[PDB]
């Protein structure tokens, strides 16, 4: 009746982590070949920050 809805924003998943990495690593002037799978596997319990 005052705060009707409680919304939870938990830590990102592997797909969510890959999405955030693709969002933030885009604009940088990259070179060569990049492999996001190892980065996703290593980063556990991380945040967008």
């Amino acid at each position: 009746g005052r705060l009707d809805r409680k919304i939870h924003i938990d830590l990102p998943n592997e797909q969510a982590r890959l999405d955030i990495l693709k969002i933030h690593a885009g604009p940088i002037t990259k070179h060569g070949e990049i492999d996001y799978e190892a980065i996703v596997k290593l980063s556990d319990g991380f945040n967008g920050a």
Binding site: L3, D4, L11, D19, N47, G48
Partner: protein, 181 residues
Amino acid sequence: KLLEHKEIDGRLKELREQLKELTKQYEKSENDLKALQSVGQIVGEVLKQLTEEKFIVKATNGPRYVVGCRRQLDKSKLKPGTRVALDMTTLTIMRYLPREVDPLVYNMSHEDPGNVSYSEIGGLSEQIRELREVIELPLTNPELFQRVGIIPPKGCLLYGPPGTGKTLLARAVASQLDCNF
């Protein structure tokens, strides 16, 4: 040939050019002297009227006064609770004013140079829909809930570990919606 007046004509033209600025200066001086012949008025709130010519009004501070009103002013707009301006030497009703807006609320009303959209936030495509289900659809198409026979909720809160994207989502919602905020 006929330039006997040409030198004097040029002198007159230069004098007129100077007189243009001299008249702008005279006008500026006139506005300056005219502006400095007015005084301010105290501000208060009306409570009720005793008779045709007597009201009782309360200033912003404590004291309450029994005062008169101007003759030409309309008396049909002076309902209790409105804001009025009174003379500082006789305390007579002179003018009614609209409701106040605080400078703090004015600053709070609009402060957002950010322009973040939904493309810069990812990984929580379900909670964003859950939130938008509350503040977007009912405010535009309100007959659906009336047809079903319920009332949409009012508020909600977001919680979780630090740095998961709460204030960012709030900024995106505020920056991508056409309504008072």
